[PDB]
Structures are given as structure tokens and as C-alpha cells.
Structure 1
Amino acid sequence: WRQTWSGPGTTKRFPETVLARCVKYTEIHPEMRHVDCQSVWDAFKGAFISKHPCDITEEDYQPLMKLGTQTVPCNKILLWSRIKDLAHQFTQVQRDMFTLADTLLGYLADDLTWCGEFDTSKINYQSCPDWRKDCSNNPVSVFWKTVSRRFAEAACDVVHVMLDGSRSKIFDKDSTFGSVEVHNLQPEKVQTLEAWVIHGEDSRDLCQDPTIKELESIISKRNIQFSCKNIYRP
């Protein structure tokens, strides 16, 4: 039996959008011709269709992760927390830096919402679970959790993270960066995490904020060097 959820339903034209994005991505990036976009869509579907949308596991997304596997320039990863648009905008100018949005899976899934239901093979366009009001293990949250774990595992040498100085918690231990990514930067592989605290709020040294000291101690226990910089948005 189905229930009404508290969050928006699946983005209109979801199947066509994912397929069209996959076709566009594989055209631009020749390294990915070995991917059949029909196969990618099948695997995507099998992660959440005919499943209760609060019982989704990272394991459900493994077939899609396997088809969407992609080498990346591991020494040029730019992570970010709660500052997506500015991050992307930074990498359009500093072109040699690489974010999750530049990967196939991140490009396919950007700004979309999706879920299914236990009793049917249909996409639910009516509503989907809100992460706070309904459940954390919903199709969208678990997707981003899964790809993020894997993206952090891929990084090497010097990893950069853009953080937003205008947030109450500049570093939030409970965000995706703060839980999943920070704890999966691999001790040997990654030598340094360099944080960039962005101003646009208080205009003084924000690298001494309690939450940045938290971030420093977390990183430090994984045998990774930590650096911080105050940077000003134009």
C-alpha cells in the first residue's frame, strides 16, 4: 500500500532527461563510449523502482556505480559543502579543477528528484520522501551518499574543499561532506586537505571558527595535513 509523502514528487520527464544527459555526456567525453545509455538507465531504474522509498540502500545503487565508473584526475578534486553553484562557477574559470558535477553520474543526477513505490513498477510523480520529515534512506539521499563515498575514495594528493562563510556551521559535521566524504579520504592516498572559507557575514579570520577547528582535528586523525584559507567572493 502506498502513502503520500511530504516532499516533491519525481521531476517531470525524468527518464528522458537522464537518457538525454547520458547521451550528451558520452558525446562530449570520448573516454566514455563504452557506456550504453540504455544500460545506464536500466541500472538507475533498478536501484529504486518497485522498492519502498525509505528502504533504499547504497547496495541498491551498486549496479549503477559499476556502469558509471570513471577514472578521474584524482589530484585536482574540488569538494564543497552547501555552496554548489559558486563551486561550479570557480571551476569554469579555473578549468583544471574537477568536481562531482563533472562526472557522468553527478551530471546525470543534478537537481533532479526521483522515487518509486513498493507495489508498482511506476515512477512516483506525486510525491517523494522528505529527508527530515519522512526518512533519510530515500532514493535521492542514498544516491548522493553512495557516489560521494566513492568520489572521496578516488581523491589523492592535495584535495580542496570550498565552504560557505555565511552559514551558521561553516563546517557541518552532519552534512554529506562532513560525514561521508571527510571520513573516506584515504590516509595514504591523500596528503593534504585545503579548505577555502568563502566570504560574500563577519569579515575576519574564519579559519579559527570552532567548526573549522573541528574539521582540522577530524582530518588530522586520518594522518592528513590540513590547510585553511580565507577567500573573498566577487
Structure 2
Amino acid sequence: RWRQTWSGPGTTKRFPETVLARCVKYTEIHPEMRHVDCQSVWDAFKGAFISKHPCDITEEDYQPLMKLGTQTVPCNKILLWSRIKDLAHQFTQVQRDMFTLEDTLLGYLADDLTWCGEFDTSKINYQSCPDWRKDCSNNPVSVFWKTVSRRFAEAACDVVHVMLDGSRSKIFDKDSTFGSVEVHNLQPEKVQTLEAWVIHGGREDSRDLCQDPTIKELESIISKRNIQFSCKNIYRPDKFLQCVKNPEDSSC
């Protein structure tokens, strides 16, 4: 068909099979999730968006799935990220120094996937799904991430870290999930500090990007929530990862 209902990519091929298989793998690997019934998880995930208008999804739609995906995360070891998920993930993969959202069952189930249904049919839409900008923000994927990211941020305590992409024109972006949801849902009663790691993309010698106006904005916002702010440059992410794998080892 030469045209489609929405402007975004349609549901990821074999979405039901993919989510199911991810749930099985996760609960097989992660002991604490060992009892989880992956069929019930799939059904609850389905229940959030099937037969529903994909511009009319709410956080409530995802509550059955949230309940089933309830999981304790070590509160002082949370790593948030904005844009640069590959480094964040490569980092936590070394020795589980920290946990990102994609290390939780629910984040793992949905990572890199697109999905939506149709009002008044039970069909998954494999042709297109709403674009957040062009179509609607209350779509199944955007609403899912907002809901799960809020919960993840509320679970954090002590020092919370965030990797930010220093090669972007807005290192801290208030419109991102990190900036619009996570920063506002850290609980000042529990969270002592937010420490930003600003990942350089520019090769070799570069600025102190902790002085970037958007970082100063982030500092102001966090400080005004009664949370301390710290910032560090990571000048060579490749060296950084090497030092994580082999610390004190070289020129670290």
C-alpha cells in the first residue's frame, strides 16, 4: 500500500514472539524473576494497547504489566542515560557496576521495539505506529517508556549516575526521557547526588563540557530539588571502558 495511517515505523516483526522470548530469557537468567509467568506478562503487555486507539494510551493501561514486572533494583547503583545507550550498556555489562533501565525485565522486554494496535480490532499494526512528534505523544511506545522510566527513577537512592552525550548540541535535553521524566521523579528524600558523566565524541583534546550551558541548567534544576549535582568529563570513552575492564592496569 502506497500510504499508511501513521508516520512512524509499524510494530516490530514477530513482536509477540520477540517479547515472549525475551521474557523467557530474562527470567531464565535473573533468579529474582524466576517465578514470573511470561505468558501472563505477554497478556498484560498486550492488554495495555490491543483494541485501543494508539493515540489514546494512558499510564493506567500499563498497570497490569507494571505489577507483573515489579522488581527490586539496587537503589544506589542506578545508571540513567540520555542518547548514548550503547556505552551505558557496554559499561554495565563489564561487571554490573551499575543497572540501567534495560537491565530490568520491563526495559529488557521493550528495548528497541515498536508496537501499536487499532481501535476496535484486536490486530497488531505492523504497517505504521504513531510518531511522537508528528502524530501523538500518548502512543503505546512513548507511554510505556514514560511509565517505566518514572518508576525506575523513583526507585533510585544515594548517588545516581547519568551518562550524557557530549557530542550533541544539547548535552542535557529537557525534552528527553531523562530530562522530562527521570530528573523530576528522583526522590530528594532518598537521592543524595546526581552525578553526570559527560561522554565526549570529539576525538582527543576537548573542552570542559561540565561547563556547558545545558549542564548548568541541569545543575540548577537538580540543586533546586535539594539534590547535589556532580559532573565529570569522560574524554575518551574507549579508554574509559578499557579501564573498567582492566582497572589500575594501564594508563588509567
Same fold (TM over 0.5): yes
Contact 1:53 1:137 in 2 (8 A): yes
Q: Which moved more, 1:62-71 or 1:24-33?
A: 24-33
When residues 2 and 61 of structure 1 are mapped into structure 2, their CA distance, relative to the original with a 3 A threshold, is farther
Deviation of 1:126 after TM superposition, in Å, equals 1.1
Q: Which moved more, 1:114-123 or 1:87-96?
A: 87-96
Deviation of 1:33 after TM superposition, in Å, equals 2.1
Deviation of 1:10 after TM superposition, in Å, equals 0.5
Q: Which moved more, 1:27-36 or 1:142-151?
A: 27-36
Deviation of 1:94 after TM superposition, in Å, equals 4.6
SS in 2 for 1:144: helix
Contact 1:2 1:117 in 2 (8 A): no
Give runs of ≥4 in structure 1 deviating > 3 Å: none
When residues 94 and 30 of structure 1 are mapped into structure 2, their CA distance, relative to the original with a 3 A threshold, is closer
Aligned-partner Cα distance in 2 for 1:22–1:96? 23
Aligned-partner Cα distance in 2 for 1:86–1:96? 13
Normalising by structure 1, we get a TM-score of: 0.96
The superposition leaves residues 172-224 of structure 1 with CA deviations (integer Å, 9 ceiling, x where unpaired) of 0111100100000001100000000011x981111111100100011011110
Aligned-partner Cα distance in 2 for 1:142–1:61? 8
Structure 2 match to 1:142: 143
The superposition leaves residues 59-87 of structure 1 with CA deviations (integer Å, 9 ceiling, x where unpaired) of 11111001000000110001000111111
Aligned-partner Cα distance in 1 for 2:126–2:157? 40
Contact 1:74 1:155 in 2 (8 A): yes
Q: CA RMSD in A?
A: 1.8
Aligned-partner Cα distance in 2 for 1:173–1:24? 34
Contact 2:49 2:61 in 1 (8 A): yes
Aligned-partner Cα distance in 1 for 2:94–2:207? 26
Deviation of 1:228 after TM superposition, in Å, equals 0.4
Counterpart mapping for 1:1-234 below 5 A: 4-199=5-200, 203-233=206-236
Contact 1:2 1:118 in 2 (8 A): no
> Percent identity of the aligned residues?
100
Deviation of 1:168 after TM superposition, in Å, equals 0.5
The superposition leaves residues 78-129 of structure 1 with CA deviations (integer Å, 9 ceiling, x where unpaired) of 1000111111011122522111111000110010100001020010111111
The alignment covers a number of residue pairs equal to: 232
Normalising by structure 2, we get a TM-score of: 0.89
Deviation of 1:2 after TM superposition, in Å, equals 13
Contact 1:187 1:223 in 2 (8 A): yes
Gaps of 5+ in 1: none
Aligned-partner Cα distance in 1 for 2:156–2:124? 34
The superposition leaves residues 120-179 of structure 1 with CA deviations (integer Å, 9 ceiling, x where unpaired) of 001011111111111111100000000000000000000000001100000001111001
When residues 136 and 149 of structure 1 are mapped into structure 2, their CA distance, relative to the original with a 3 A threshold, is same
Q: Which moved more, 1:89-98 or 1:68-77?
A: 89-98
Aligned-partner Cα distance in 2 for 1:94–1:30? 17
